[PDB]
Design an enzyme around this catalytic site. Structure first.
Site, mmCIF file in Angstrom:
data_model
loop_
_atom_site.group_PDB
_atom_site.id
_atom_site.type_symbol
_atom_site.label_atom_id
_atom_site.label_comp_id
_atom_site.label_asym_id
_atom_site.label_seq_id
_atom_site.Cartn_x
_atom_site.Cartn_y
_atom_site.Cartn_z
ATOM 1 N N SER A 34 0.809 -1.216 0.000
ATOM 2 C CA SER A 34 0.000 0.000 0.000
ATOM 3 C C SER A 34 0.852 1.281 0.000
ATOM 4 O O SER A 34 0.442 2.308 -0.538
ATOM 5 C CB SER A 34 -0.983 -0.012 1.174
ATOM 6 O OG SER A 34 -1.967 -1.027 1.021
ATOM 7 N N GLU A 85 5.917 -6.502 7.163
ATOM 8 C CA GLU A 85 5.978 -7.823 6.571
ATOM 9 C C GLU A 85 7.285 -7.899 5.828
ATOM 10 O O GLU A 85 7.596 -7.020 5.005
ATOM 11 C CB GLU A 85 4.845 -8.035 5.597
ATOM 12 C CG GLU A 85 3.572 -8.519 6.238
ATOM 13 C CD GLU A 85 2.455 -8.637 5.231
ATOM 14 O OE1 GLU A 85 2.644 -9.368 4.222
ATOM 15 O OE2 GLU A 85 1.410 -7.978 5.440
ATOM 16 N N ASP A 128 3.047 -18.369 -3.649
ATOM 17 C CA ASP A 128 2.847 -16.930 -3.569
ATOM 18 C C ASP A 128 4.064 -16.156 -4.027
ATOM 19 O O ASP A 128 3.920 -15.035 -4.506
ATOM 20 C CB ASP A 128 2.491 -16.482 -2.154
ATOM 21 C CG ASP A 128 1.077 -16.872 -1.746
ATOM 22 O OD1 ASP A 128 0.184 -16.964 -2.620
ATOM 23 O OD2 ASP A 128 0.856 -17.079 -0.531
ATOM 24 N N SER A 173 -14.370 -28.181 1.339
ATOM 25 C CA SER A 173 -15.479 -28.408 2.241
ATOM 26 C C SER A 173 -15.619 -27.231 3.181
ATOM 27 O O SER A 173 -14.827 -26.299 3.141
ATOM 28 C CB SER A 173 -15.204 -29.671 3.048
ATOM 29 O OG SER A 173 -13.857 -29.664 3.500
ATOM 30 N N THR A 174 -16.626 -27.293 4.040
ATOM 31 C CA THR A 174 -16.903 -26.237 5.001
ATOM 32 C C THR A 174 -15.830 -26.211 6.083
ATOM 33 O O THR A 174 -15.478 -25.148 6.614
ATOM 34 C CB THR A 174 -18.292 -26.451 5.610
ATOM 35 O OG1 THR A 174 -19.234 -26.574 4.544
ATOM 36 C CG2 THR A 174 -18.706 -25.285 6.482
ATOM 37 N N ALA A 175 -15.305 -27.395 6.387
ATOM 38 C CA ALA A 175 -14.237 -27.553 7.366
ATOM 39 C C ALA A 175 -12.959 -26.877 6.902
ATOM 40 O O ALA A 175 -12.201 -26.357 7.717
ATOM 41 C CB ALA A 175 -13.982 -29.018 7.630
ATOM 42 N N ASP A 176 -12.719 -26.891 5.593
ATOM 43 C CA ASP A 176 -11.545 -26.226 5.031
ATOM 44 C C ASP A 176 -11.685 -24.729 5.268
ATOM 45 O O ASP A 176 -10.718 -24.025 5.525
ATOM 46 C CB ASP A 176 -11.422 -26.492 3.522
ATOM 47 C CG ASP A 176 -11.113 -27.945 3.197
ATOM 48 O OD1 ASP A 176 -10.200 -28.530 3.821
ATOM 49 O OD2 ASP A 176 -11.784 -28.505 2.305
ATOM 50 N N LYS A 203 -4.131 -6.142 -3.640
ATOM 51 C CA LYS A 203 -4.695 -6.126 -2.288
ATOM 52 C C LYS A 203 -5.699 -4.999 -2.017
ATOM 53 O O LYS A 203 -6.674 -5.218 -1.316
ATOM 54 C CB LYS A 203 -3.615 -6.247 -1.186
ATOM 55 C CG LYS A 203 -2.821 -4.978 -0.895
ATOM 56 C CD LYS A 203 -1.510 -5.279 -0.154
ATOM 57 C CE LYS A 203 -1.672 -5.222 1.360
ATOM 58 N NZ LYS A 203 -0.567 -5.944 2.045
ATOM 59 N N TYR A 229 -10.911 -5.076 6.090
ATOM 60 C CA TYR A 229 -9.550 -4.919 5.615
ATOM 61 C C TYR A 229 -9.146 -3.456 5.775
ATOM 62 O O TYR A 229 -8.036 -3.149 6.198
ATOM 63 C CB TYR A 229 -9.444 -5.389 4.161
ATOM 64 C CG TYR A 229 -8.208 -4.933 3.431
ATOM 65 C CD1 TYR A 229 -7.016 -5.633 3.530
ATOM 66 C CD2 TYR A 229 -8.235 -3.802 2.628
ATOM 67 C CE1 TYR A 229 -5.868 -5.207 2.853
ATOM 68 C CE2 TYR A 229 -7.107 -3.366 1.948
ATOM 69 C CZ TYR A 229 -5.923 -4.073 2.061
ATOM 70 O OH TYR A 229 -4.800 -3.646 1.381
#
EC number: 2.7.7.47
Length: 260
Positions: A34, A85, A128, A173-176, A203, A229
Site C-alpha cells: 500500500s 511484513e 505466492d 469443504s466447510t471444514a476447510d 490487495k 480490511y
C-alpha cells in the site's frame, strides 16, 4: 514513485537492521504494498522483499525475527509504528526460477506469539512467491540494490495461472473454510481480479473492482471483508460462515480458468 514521509523513518530502521544482520549476502531490498500503490490507511503494513545470495545462519534468522518484532507493532496499535511484513528469498530461487520457489524466511504480526516463544518457522515452498515477484515487477521501490525490473525475470504465463489458482483446491469443504473465512473471501476476490485484469498487485483494488459485478447476496459478503480490511469495521466471521461458504462456491464457479 516515492516513499511516503510518514513511513520514511520506520522503513530506514528496518533497512539498516537488515543490511546489518545480512551483511555481505544482501543483494536487494524492495518496498512494496500500500505504501507504493493504493495509498496508506491507518492499518497498512510496510512490506519488504529481501533478496540474498546464501542462506541465513540460524543465529541470523533468530536476530532478524527478534529485531523485526521490535520494529513492528500490530496494525492499528500505535501511530508512528506500523506492522511490518518481511520476506527473505534466495536469489537462486528466482534466477533461474524454481517452481514453486522456497522462501527462506517470513516475518509478520501473525508470528508475534510464536516469536515470543522463540519459535521461528523454517524455509518452505510458497507459490505466492511467483505472485510476489510478479507484483513487484509492476510496482516497487528498490530501497537497496537494483530495481526489480533489472533483477528479476517473469514467470511464464502458465506458472502464473498455476500460482493464482493453487489456493482454490485448498477449500473443498466447510471444514476447510471454517476458521479462515476472512482471508479466503479476500483471496478469492484477489484471484478473480488478477485473472480478469491481468493485474497482480491486488490487495487494495480487487474488492472495489468486483463488488459492482456481484449479485447483492454475495456482494454483501465481500463488502464486509473489504470494510474489515480497511479497518473501519470488524465482523464476527463465525456467524458469517454459511454466507462465506456460499461465497466460496459462487466464486469457484465464476472465477476465470484463464487470463482474459
Amino acid at each position: 514513485l516515492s516513499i511516503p514521509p510518514s513511513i520514511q523513518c520506520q522503513t530506514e530502521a528496518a533497512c539498516r537492521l537488515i543490511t546489518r544482520v545480512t551483511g555481505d549476502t544482501l543483494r536487494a531490498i524492495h518496498l512494496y504494498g500500500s505504501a507504493v500503490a493504493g495509498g496508506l490507511k491507518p492499518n497498512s503494513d510496510i512490506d519488504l522483499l529481501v533478496t540474498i545470495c546464501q542462506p541465513l545462519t540460524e543465529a541470523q534468522r533468530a536476530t532478524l525475527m527478534q529485531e523485526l518484532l521490535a520494529l513492528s507493532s500490530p496494525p492499528g496499535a500505535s501511530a508512528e509504528k506500523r506492522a511490518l511484513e518481511v520476506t527473505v528469498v534466495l536469489y537462486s530461487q528466482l534466477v533461474p526460477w524454481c517452481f514453486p520457489p522456497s522462501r527462506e524466511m517470513q516475518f509478520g504480526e501473525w508470528l508475534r506469539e510464536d516469536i515470543c516463544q522463540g519459535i521461528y518457522e523454517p524455509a518452505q515452498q510458497d507459490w505466492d512467491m511467483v505472485l510476489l515477484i510478479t507484483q513487484i515487477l509492476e510496482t516497487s521501490i528498490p530501497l537497496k540494490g537494483e530495481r526489480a525490473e533489472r533483477l528479476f525475470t517473469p514467470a511464464p504465463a502458465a506458472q502464473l495461472l498455476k500460482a493464482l489458482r493453487y489456493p482454490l483446491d485448498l477449500w473443498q469443504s466447510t471444514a476447510d473454510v471454517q476458521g479462515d473465512e476472512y482471508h479466503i473471501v479476500l483471496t478469492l476476490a484477489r484471484i478473480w481480479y488478477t485473472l480478469s485484469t491481468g493485474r497482480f498487485t491486488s490487495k487494495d483494488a480487487a474488492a472495489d473492482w468486483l463488488l459492482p459485478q456481484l449479485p447483492e447476496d454475495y456482494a454483501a459478503t465481500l463488502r464486509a471483508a473489504q470494510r474489515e480490511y480497511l479497518g473501519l469495521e470488524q465482523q464476527d466471521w463465525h456467524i458469517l460462515l454459511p454466507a462465506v461458504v456460499r461465497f466460496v462456491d459462487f466464486a469457484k464457479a465464476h472465477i476465470p480458468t484463464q487470463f482474459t
